Amino acid sequence: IRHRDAIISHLNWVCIFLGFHSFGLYIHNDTMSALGRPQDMFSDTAIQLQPVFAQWIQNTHFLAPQLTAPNALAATSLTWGGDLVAVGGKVAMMPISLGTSDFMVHH
Amino acid sequence: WLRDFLWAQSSQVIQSYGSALSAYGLIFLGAHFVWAFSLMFLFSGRGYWQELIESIVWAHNKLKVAPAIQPRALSITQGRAVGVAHYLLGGIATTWSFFLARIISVG
Amino acid sequence: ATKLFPKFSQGLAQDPTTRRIWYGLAMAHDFESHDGMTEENLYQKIFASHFGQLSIIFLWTSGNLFHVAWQGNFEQWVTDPVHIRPIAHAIWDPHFGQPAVEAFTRGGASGPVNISTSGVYQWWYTIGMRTNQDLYVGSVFLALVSAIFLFAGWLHLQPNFQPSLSWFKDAESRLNHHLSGLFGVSSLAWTGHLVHVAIPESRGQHVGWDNFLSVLPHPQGLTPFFTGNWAAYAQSPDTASHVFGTAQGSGQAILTFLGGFHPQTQSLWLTDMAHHHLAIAVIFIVAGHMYRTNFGIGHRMQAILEAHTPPSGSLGAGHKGLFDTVNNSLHFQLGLALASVGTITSLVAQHMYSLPPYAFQAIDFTTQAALYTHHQYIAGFIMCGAFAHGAIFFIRDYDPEQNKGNVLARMLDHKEALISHLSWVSLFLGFHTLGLYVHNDVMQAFGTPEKQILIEPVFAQWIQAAHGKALYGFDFLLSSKTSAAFANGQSLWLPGWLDAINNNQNSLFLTIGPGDFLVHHAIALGLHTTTLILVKGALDARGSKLMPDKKDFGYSFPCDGPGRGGTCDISAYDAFYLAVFWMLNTIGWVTFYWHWKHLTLWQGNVAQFDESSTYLMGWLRDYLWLNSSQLINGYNPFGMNSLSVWAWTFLFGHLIYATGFMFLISWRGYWQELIETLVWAHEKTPLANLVYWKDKPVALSIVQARLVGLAHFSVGYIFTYAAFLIASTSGRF
Amino acid sequence: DIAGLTPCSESKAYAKLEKKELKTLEKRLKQYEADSAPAVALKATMERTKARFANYAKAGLLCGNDGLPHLIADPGLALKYGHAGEVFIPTFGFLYVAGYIGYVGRQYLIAVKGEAKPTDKEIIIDVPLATKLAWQGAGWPLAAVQELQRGTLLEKEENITVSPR
Amino acid sequence: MKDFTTYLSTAPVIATIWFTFTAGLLIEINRYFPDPLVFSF
Amino acid sequence: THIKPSAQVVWPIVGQEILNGDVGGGFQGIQITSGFFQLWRASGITSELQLYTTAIGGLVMAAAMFFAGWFHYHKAAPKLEWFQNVESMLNHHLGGLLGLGSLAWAG
Amino acid sequence: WTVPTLNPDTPSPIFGGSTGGLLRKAQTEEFYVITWEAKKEQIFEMPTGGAAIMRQGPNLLKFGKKEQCLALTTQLRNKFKLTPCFYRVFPDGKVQYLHPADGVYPEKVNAGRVGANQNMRRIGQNVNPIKVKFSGRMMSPAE
């Protein structure tokens, strides 16, 4: 309670910073796509904002039965990587690939 | 998100009339209604509604049907609570109907 | 300490916060609240501001003309107006990518351009303009007129040209001159233009300042006029084979009463409009000779008003003491003027789509839609302002002692009855319209559309059949080929009128059904609830049971505190702010109805509206969702087209609307504490406490919050629907 | 032949809609066996559909180009062409019941106004009194007219008003 | 059980009972007289 | 893999028997989204009789809970010092509620 | 009774510091000082957020707002039954005694304070705004 001003000021700042660098990315991309400049967007093709930390964690959990969980036969989820499980012709679960859109929406 | 998610995936909830998913279209529309109805309580204040209520209480007193439990407008706090409750209900039920009508059809 | 900017308020100049800037921006034109304001200085500043508004209007028209002439395709559009799109102005946006430079190259232009949804091309083509030099000269002339009005506004603020307070309060002379000259002689001069320029230019003959004294408007020049043989001016009208702008099937008449539409342009006859403005000019000139001026004849409005006291005391004192009330209150005058102007703006909107006055209008569908939506939203705003200023009158200007027992006090006397009956009509219309729509939605949901409540609008259909629509079989007045009303018009407008109203490809008295019934009752609910909110804010403006001393607090004020149960949104300003939402919804219903009816008419699929407008999933599915496809595909991962700007503007309006939600739901007190924390943060941040504010940051006031939220709301509403309307009409047509 | 509306017995779009609904129902019915619970349900639904169409065409309802029954609100057109049961008769049918409700509630309010705590007789309903008044409110129109003619339905200027009247 | 029947006479309980009654009456009317678009009987 | 889970049947009253959709299994009802079928198959139910008896047990336990509320308020209500035994409450809720519960489900 | 002069040698409650205290306003225009005599060392709530220990004897406290000082005043009077008085201090060094301006608290009478802003009419007896129109500044009929 005695330093609530600092807490709330820094929370306000991070909220504004995140709002800008998350939603203004969408606005920049909308403006560029409307202006006819898809090469200037934050896309997986033009300006890649790749979530490399989440991708690394994905790859690390996928390769866990090999090094860091050797008594497990497979990874906890197929979302980390690997092949799909199809039941009745439909996909039960399959690897989820994270890209620029996933970066933007996670932020 | 507007075109390829909201507008595209709404084709199952708005075309559900005459199906077993018609209740989902009905609740889609009704949740839209409740959501917009929340905006009468959120955008407004108690002082307009108390004056309207007293002008109506005049008409009830004229015909001798003025209740003994005096009609009041909802408190400011209650106005806000009703507004947010109807907002949450409308939005969440709209998403509920949209999601279920979409994914029961396509999945 | 004391600042300089709000020169008109010392209390705002001494305000150390950011509220000073905002309130000086928003109290600038409330001249009555200015420090050291005299009534005479008030009226004089109003006069000067009116001159400035006129100058701005004429400059705006000059700019429209100039850009259509310079960057437009007016000289090519007059050649093929059905096929060529009108250019509004060119685009020079350095943010454009080459795909956008390619996509906005429309209308036969050399580069990126904007397509005019304004209708000014059809208008200027109808009134005789054919070249870009005509528009250039018109723009120069209107810029000169704007400069002249600016100079007049400066001049009539100078000491020996500042008019007295009574000169503004001279109502009889102003009315005489504004009916006779401003309305009447102006219409006579417009008739002169149509007779001398527009009609000959529609007959292929070029008439300009170079030759208009050398060409006759009629082969029998002024002999039929001075001899009373006025029908000689209607002998040879334009044929049905007439092609606009040419001499093929010309006709020699200048004053007709043909009625209906020019068949090639699907527009009103120019000779009909000339005769219209001639008749209206005569009528207004004789109307402007009614009131008493320095010549001993005429009426005094005070006498007329004080004489109109019914016996039986049914209106009490009647209109006694009302001349003083109207003449001394600028808000009464302003409310009357806004009421009338908004009503006639709605009239313009309703008549220009049914009776398109301009050539090759009604085939420019985007133009029709834009004009209707434009003028109807303008009218809704003006009509909200009418009641707003009526409330401001009741608070600031109304004297209950000088209006002792007249109709105006008799209003406040039974205001609870008025408000409760408007409440009943709103409640009934809402209950039953929504209930029938929901019943029909549930019936279409259960796959049983034959159980819908489809009430045939037989009253409006009876009216339509009285005008000659033979689709219903009422055979009453003009649909009855044996009536006297029908017989007496056959030498007159009625052939054209009945050929035009029975043509189901125009918008003259469209065929209506149960969907029209339901949406007209929704429109009625909207009108009744909007005027309920506005009337209730105007009549409870001087006090209520919750706040009996409200007149002492002004028109706008935040609240009266959380006491007495809570007084949020208590003022008349708050009633206006609440009524603007309901007005926007009313006009949204109106323009939705218009646009869908006309989109199904233009597509040759009226059955779509007739079958889907009885339930609201048809409105959502077949109007909002179906017509949004091209709009939202204005830009996609596979490129963009000229609808990219309307897609962007769509999302823009949505964003502004939602931001307004921020100011409407979230209120001041959260933001003041947040701003206090931010103040602390700035004062304690190194390298940034070097920079300090001069105005202390504070959250927006409560009234200002409501204003800003309503402004974001309305701007988003308007931009969203304009984007959707233009993109759904311009995407197909 | 009122507003270009054809009777639903003579309209072809009406029969088209009937056969369309029945085709939907029988295309659902083809999936099940002879007498299943779903088959019974769908056969009952088909019978209800045919009965509904027959009963709407029998009631002299007018249909549009879409084959849907349209109601005639106007008295004079409803009474001239036999469409009074659409909007005109149910109008008074409703108004009877609505005045019933209002008159019963009014009488309850007036009866509990006399008690020492009239407010606690409104959150806690006097059920015997309410049922007495609900039963004797069947003659609400006559009683309301006779209360209107005595000047006892309305209150005089004892109602409260704001300061500018 | 005077207090219990006083509870049952409360506004919410009486409202629940009365609206269950009204809704059941309408539901039974619509079961035995299905699809009543117009007054023809 | 072909039958849509449904556990709610609608009465045919106002035309709402259209919501009783063709979900499969010679059945007409509302396709549920609760996952109860998969949960029951994971528990190894394989019969409607077991679900019925679980329902009866649940009603018995609801009566037990309401009796316990009445008992622990009106008949033998715990003192404040009993609620403030947070150490014992945590010991029992970890070992018994979650430990014995997880052990019983494991069994 | 006469106006007491603020003794600056008064100690302050035991407080570990906050972020809700004085800002540049104290350096620029004005701040506020509240003094009270405590019978024993007691923990009270700071209006700035946080708990402080008032010392046995006289206690001085600085605040940047009058509402803070009167909030602490009402807390000390209602939860501790003390008798605080606070001042307005300017960066000039000028001290203006504020709260018990008469010596007694304003909820009680002292027989010698003059009434101000007392309209001798009813609130429904105010004139209409059309009577006070064009009064120079924008005014209410209550004046």
Ligand code: CLA
């Ligand atoms: C205000 C708008 C409105 C209106 C006018 C209607 C009107 C109607 N609806 Mg729709 N509906 C609405 C809103 C509305 N609804 C909404 C909001 C919904 C969604 C919840 C629905 C959903 C809906 C469905 C799903 C259905 C209807 C149906 C109907 C019809 C009912 C006929 C009926 O029950 O006969 C009742 C006949 C009577 C005579 C009852 C009158 C009441 C009493 C009994 C009369 C008094 C007699 C006597 C004096 C009593 C003595 C005392 C007693 C205690 C013994 C009618 C056309 C049904 C239909 O078939 O439509 C075609 C139908 O299936 N509606």
Ligand code: CLA
């Ligand atoms: C679309 C609607 C909308 C928008 C844009 C905002 C925007 C904001 N809200 Mg609000 N809010 C809204 C609706 C909205 N709100 C509603 C409906 C509610 C419910 C009542 C609230 C309730 C609410 C609360 C309670 C709080 C906020 C907060 C915030 C801020 C956090 C994000 C931020 O600063 O990032 C940066 C700004 C944005 C993301 C906004 C969009 C800006 C983009 C990037 C464009 C930039 C334009 C660029 C400068 C060009 C300028 C052009 C020039 C010509 C002027 C921001 C000012 C919080 C806050 O202020 O603390 C941080 C907060 O505490 N809002």
Ligand code: CLA
């Ligand atoms: C013949 C003499 C005469 C004339 C021409 C005018 C003309 C005018 N006066 Mg003046 N005035 C006069 C005598 C006159 N007055 C006298 C004698 C007095 C003192 C007793 C005054 C005192 C006075 C005051 C105090 C003020 C004016 C103002 C005005 C202006 C009104 C605003 C305007 O332009 O809208 C004119 C608009 C129209 C004519 C359009 C309305 C008519 C139709 C019905 C509208 C619908 C159809 C539409 C025209 C179709 C358009 C289609 C297409 C062209 C778009 C106008 C220029 C005001 C102003 O602006 O100050 C500069 C103002 O404040 N006058």
Ligand code: CLA
């Ligand atoms: C002939 C027209 C007319 C005239 C002369 C007046 C004159 C006046 N009005 Mg009235 N009024 C009018 C029309 C008119 N109004 C209409 C049509 C409405 C309804 C919309 C109102 C509603 C209204 C209210 C509710 C109030 C007034 C008030 C006033 C007074 C001062 C207003 C002020 O300070 O301006 C300052 C105005 C502004 C700073 C403008 C605000 C911004 C608006 C919302 C437009 C923003 C557009 C935005 C920039 C677009 C962005 C788009 C972009 C992003 C693409 C003044 C006497 C006030 C008054 O008298 O107080 C007692 C008052 O409370 N008027």
Ligand code: CLA
């Ligand atoms: C969809 C949104 C919406 C809706 C439905 C309404 C509805 C209404 N508004 Mg508006 N209003 C809105 C948004 C909305 N408002 C917004 C955004 C604002 C800006 C703040 C306002 C500002 C405003 C003002 C200032 C005024 C109104 C008024 C009214 C009433 C007008 C009378 C009427 O139509 O009665 C018909 C009623 C309805 C359509 C709503 C009821 C819905 C059904 C019929 C009721 C039963 C449903 C169901 C059985 C309930 C189940 C409950 C439970 C069992 C779960 C009505 C309650 C006026 C008013 O109250 O005076 C009469 C008035 O003066 N409103």
Ligand code: CLA
């Ligand atoms: C018939 C048995 C019975 C009786 C006569 C009483 C009598 C009393 N109890 Mg006890 N009680 C009982 C059973 C009983 N209780 C049970 C079974 C429980 C366990 C839950 C309790 C728990 C309990 C507590 C914790 C309290 C009481 C209190 C009281 C007193 C007044 C309660 C009141 O106003 O009731 C009227 C209240 C109701 C009828 C509300 C019942 C709500 C139920 C439990 C939930 C229903 C939710 C529903 C499904 C939601 C639907 C939503 C809708 C939209 C569909 C009174 C001495 C209170 C007191 O102050 O005593 C001195 C008190 O604090 N009782």
Ligand SMILES: CC1=C(/C=C/C(C)=C/C=C/C(C)=C/C=C/C=C(C)/C=C/C=C(C)/C=C/C2=C(C)CCCC2(C)C)C(C)(C)CCC1
């Ligand atoms: C608040 C106020 C105000 C304002 C108000 C308002 C705003 C109002 C409005 C109003 C309005 C807005 C109105 C309207 C009206 C309308 C009318 C009144 C109409 C009429 C019509 C008629 C009469 C018709 C006739 C006919 C027909 C039917 C058709 C054909 C032709 C003929 C002619 C036959 C003021 C300022 C005053 C002040 C006080 C307060």
Ligand SMILES: CC1=C(/C=C/C(C)=C/C=C/C(C)=C/C=C/C=C(C)/C=C/C=C(C)/C=C/C2=C(C)CCCC2(C)C)C(C)(C)CCC1
């Ligand atoms: C689903 C459900 C149900 C049912 C349920 C059930 C049926 C349950 C059961 C449960 C159970 C049935 C449980 C059991 C348990 C058991 C246990 C928990 C055991 C334990 C053991 C132990 C712990 C041991 C220990 C030890 C050892 C190891 C050895 C020796 C020594 C000693 C003893 C120490 C109902 C109806 C309610 C309804 C709702 C839902």
Ligand SMILES: CC1=C(C/C=C(\C)CCC[C@H](C)CCC[C@H](C)CCCC(C)C)C(=O)c2ccccc2C1=O
């Ligand atoms: C609409 C509205 C109102 C008016 C809403 C009213 C007062 C509440 C209506 C609730 C129901 C309809 C009344 C309950 C009456 C009986 C309990 C119902 C039993 C009988 C029924 C069958 C009619 C406010 O008082 C208000 C206050 C503060 C901010 C916003 C608003 C606000 O938006």
